[PDB]
Amino acid sequence: GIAAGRLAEERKAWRKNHPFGFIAKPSSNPDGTRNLFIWECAIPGKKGTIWEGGLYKIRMQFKDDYPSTPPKCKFDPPLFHPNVYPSGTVCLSILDENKDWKPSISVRQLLIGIQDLLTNPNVDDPAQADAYQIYCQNRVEYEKRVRRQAQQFSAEIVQRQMLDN
């Protein structure tokens, strides 16, 4: 299968070298077999930012026509951020085949791109009204909420959950 072949390549590349603190792993079927089409991932908050210390779990679901189509990416649980929808999906052009997705983009590039969005909101792409308004009009409150969220989803807490899965 085209998708399965590429997904095995992505797994190998990720295991060989990936950015420190990130997680990206195919899930497991009931019996322990690898399911290449659903990955459980997590993005660390960027060091030196209000996101630091947090680890933000995100699921990738691939269709059979990947890499024509990008995976569906969804933060779980949903995150407070101007460009993350209340459902946890993300407003980001590289995640849309009809905008800036192209088949060569790697899992690493997706997760780095999403991290960059966390750090640097796009004020042209509001996805949730309250986070967007607070970001634009009450930055002190924005930063308080993001710092509290980084503690709520601390690396130690979140890693323990992921190991307990």
Short mmCIF file of C-alpha atoms in Angstrom, two decimals:
data_model
loop_
_atom_site.label_atom_id
_atom_site.label_comp_id
_atom_site.label_asym_id
_atom_site.label_seq_id
_atom_site.Cartn_x
_atom_site.Cartn_y
_atom_site.Cartn_z
CA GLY A 1 0.00 0.00 0.00
CA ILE A 2 1.29 3.48 -0.85
CA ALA A 3 0.23 4.94 2.48
CA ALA A 4 1.53 2.07 4.59
CA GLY A 5 4.91 2.15 2.86
CA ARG A 6 5.32 5.85 3.45
CA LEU A 7 4.14 5.56 7.06
CA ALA A 8 6.78 2.89 7.78
CA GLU A 9 9.39 5.27 6.25
CA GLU A 10 8.15 8.11 8.49
CA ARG A 11 8.40 5.90 11.59
CA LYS A 12 11.94 4.89 10.69
CA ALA A 13 13.04 8.47 10.01
CA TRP A 14 11.49 9.70 13.26
CA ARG A 15 13.13 6.96 15.34
CA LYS A 16 16.50 7.72 13.69
CA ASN A 17 16.39 11.42 14.52
CA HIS A 18 13.69 13.66 15.93
CA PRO A 19 13.52 16.91 17.89
CA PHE A 20 14.15 16.63 21.62
CA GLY A 21 11.06 16.28 23.76
CA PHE A 22 8.66 15.43 20.92
CA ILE A 23 6.76 12.14 20.81
CA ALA A 24 5.30 10.52 17.67
CA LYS A 25 4.39 6.86 17.69
CA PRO A 26 2.00 4.64 15.82
CA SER A 27 -0.68 3.30 18.10
CA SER A 28 -1.17 -0.34 18.93
CA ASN A 29 -3.94 -2.67 17.89
CA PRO A 30 -5.47 -4.77 20.72
CA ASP A 31 -2.91 -7.55 20.27
CA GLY A 32 0.13 -5.25 20.24
CA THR A 33 0.48 -4.99 16.45
CA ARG A 34 1.42 -1.64 15.10
CA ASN A 35 -1.33 0.51 13.56
CA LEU A 36 0.49 2.83 11.18
CA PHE A 37 -2.64 4.89 10.42
CA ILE A 38 -3.17 6.34 13.91
CA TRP A 39 -0.27 8.02 15.72
CA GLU A 40 -0.23 9.33 19.27
CA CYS A 41 2.06 12.36 19.37
CA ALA A 42 3.00 15.17 21.74
CA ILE A 43 4.58 18.56 21.30
CA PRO A 44 6.75 20.15 24.00
CA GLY A 45 6.35 23.81 24.71
CA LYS A 46 9.12 25.93 23.18
CA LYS A 47 11.91 26.71 25.66
CA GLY A 48 12.07 30.38 26.70
CA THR A 49 8.34 30.88 26.01
CA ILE A 50 5.12 30.93 28.01
CA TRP A 51 4.54 27.39 26.61
CA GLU A 52 7.65 25.93 28.30
CA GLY A 53 7.23 22.94 30.60
CA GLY A 54 4.02 21.79 28.93
CA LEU A 55 3.64 18.70 26.75
CA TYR A 56 0.62 18.89 24.47
CA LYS A 57 -0.80 15.56 23.21
CA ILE A 58 -1.97 15.49 19.58
CA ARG A 59 -3.40 12.59 17.53
CA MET A 60 -2.73 12.06 13.82
CA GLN A 61 -5.17 10.00 11.73
CA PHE A 62 -4.05 9.02 8.23
CA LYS A 63 -6.36 8.06 5.36
CA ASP A 64 -5.62 5.33 2.81
CA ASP A 65 -4.67 7.98 0.25
CA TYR A 66 -1.94 9.55 2.38
CA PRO A 67 0.33 11.26 1.34
CA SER A 68 -2.03 12.79 -1.27
CA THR A 69 -4.02 13.92 1.77
CA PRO A 70 -2.49 15.06 5.07
CA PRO A 71 -3.36 13.37 8.35
CA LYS A 72 -6.18 14.86 10.42
CA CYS A 73 -4.43 16.41 13.44
CA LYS A 74 -6.32 16.98 16.70
CA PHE A 75 -5.10 18.07 20.12
CA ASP A 76 -6.52 15.84 22.85
CA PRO A 77 -7.43 17.33 25.14
CA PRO A 78 -8.33 20.57 23.34
CA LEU A 79 -5.91 23.45 23.94
CA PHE A 80 -6.42 27.11 24.70
CA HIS A 81 -4.84 28.90 21.70
CA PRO A 82 -6.18 31.41 19.15
CA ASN A 83 -5.76 29.00 16.17
CA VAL A 84 -6.95 25.76 17.81
CA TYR A 85 -10.65 25.06 17.38
CA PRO A 86 -12.72 24.13 20.45
CA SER A 87 -12.69 20.52 19.16
CA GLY A 88 -8.87 20.50 19.23
CA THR A 89 -8.31 20.61 15.46
CA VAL A 90 -5.91 23.27 14.13
CA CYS A 91 -6.21 26.11 11.66
CA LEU A 92 -2.97 25.74 9.67
CA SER A 93 -2.47 25.84 5.88
CA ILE A 94 0.05 22.98 5.68
CA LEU A 95 -2.71 20.70 7.00
CA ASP A 96 -4.91 21.32 3.94
CA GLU A 97 -4.36 19.57 0.61
CA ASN A 98 -6.09 22.48 -1.10
CA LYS A 99 -3.68 25.05 0.45
CA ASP A 100 -0.05 24.32 1.45
CA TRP A 101 0.11 20.60 2.13
CA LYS A 102 2.33 18.70 -0.25
CA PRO A 103 2.99 14.97 -0.13
CA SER A 104 6.71 15.28 0.74
CA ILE A 105 6.03 16.98 4.10
CA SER A 106 7.18 14.76 6.98
CA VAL A 107 5.65 14.01 10.38
CA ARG A 108 8.55 15.96 11.92
CA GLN A 109 7.75 19.00 9.77
CA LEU A 110 4.07 18.83 10.76
CA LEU A 111 4.82 18.70 14.48
CA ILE A 112 7.46 21.48 14.22
CA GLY A 113 4.96 23.57 12.22
CA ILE A 114 2.28 23.06 14.84
CA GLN A 115 4.75 23.96 17.63
CA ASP A 116 5.65 27.14 15.75
CA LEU A 117 1.96 28.02 15.61
CA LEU A 118 1.57 27.51 19.38
CA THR A 119 4.49 29.90 19.93
CA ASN A 120 3.36 32.36 17.24
CA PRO A 121 -0.39 32.71 16.73
CA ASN A 122 -1.70 33.78 13.33
CA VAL A 123 -4.03 36.73 13.87
CA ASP A 124 -5.51 36.23 10.37
CA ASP A 125 -6.82 32.74 11.29
CA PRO A 126 -8.98 32.88 14.41
CA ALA A 127 -10.23 29.39 15.38
CA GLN A 128 -11.65 30.02 18.84
CA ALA A 129 -13.25 33.31 19.77
CA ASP A 130 -12.21 33.64 23.41
CA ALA A 131 -8.53 32.68 23.03
CA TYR A 132 -8.30 34.97 20.01
CA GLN A 133 -9.92 37.95 21.74
CA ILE A 134 -7.78 37.51 24.86
CA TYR A 135 -4.63 37.17 22.74
CA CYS A 136 -5.39 40.37 20.85
CA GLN A 137 -6.83 42.54 23.61
CA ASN A 138 -5.66 41.20 27.00
CA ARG A 139 -2.15 39.78 26.62
CA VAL A 140 -1.43 39.71 30.36
CA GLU A 141 -4.40 37.38 30.83
CA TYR A 142 -3.40 35.38 27.71
CA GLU A 143 0.02 34.68 29.17
CA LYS A 144 -1.39 33.79 32.62
CA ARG A 145 -3.75 31.25 31.05
CA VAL A 146 -1.04 29.73 28.83
CA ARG A 147 1.40 29.45 31.77
CA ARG A 148 -1.33 27.73 33.86
CA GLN A 149 -2.06 25.38 30.95
CA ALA A 150 1.65 24.45 30.75
CA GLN A 151 1.49 23.37 34.42
CA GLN A 152 -1.83 21.54 33.90
CA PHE A 153 -0.17 19.62 31.08
CA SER A 154 3.32 19.33 32.59
CA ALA A 155 5.76 17.04 30.81
CA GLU A 156 5.91 14.68 33.83
CA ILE A 157 2.11 14.43 34.14
CA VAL A 158 1.49 13.94 30.42
CA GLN A 159 4.38 11.49 29.94
CA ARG A 160 3.00 9.36 32.76
CA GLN A 161 -0.41 9.25 31.03
CA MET A 162 1.18 8.31 27.71
CA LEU A 163 3.18 5.49 29.34
CA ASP A 164 0.04 4.24 31.10
CA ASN A 165 -1.90 3.93 27.82
#
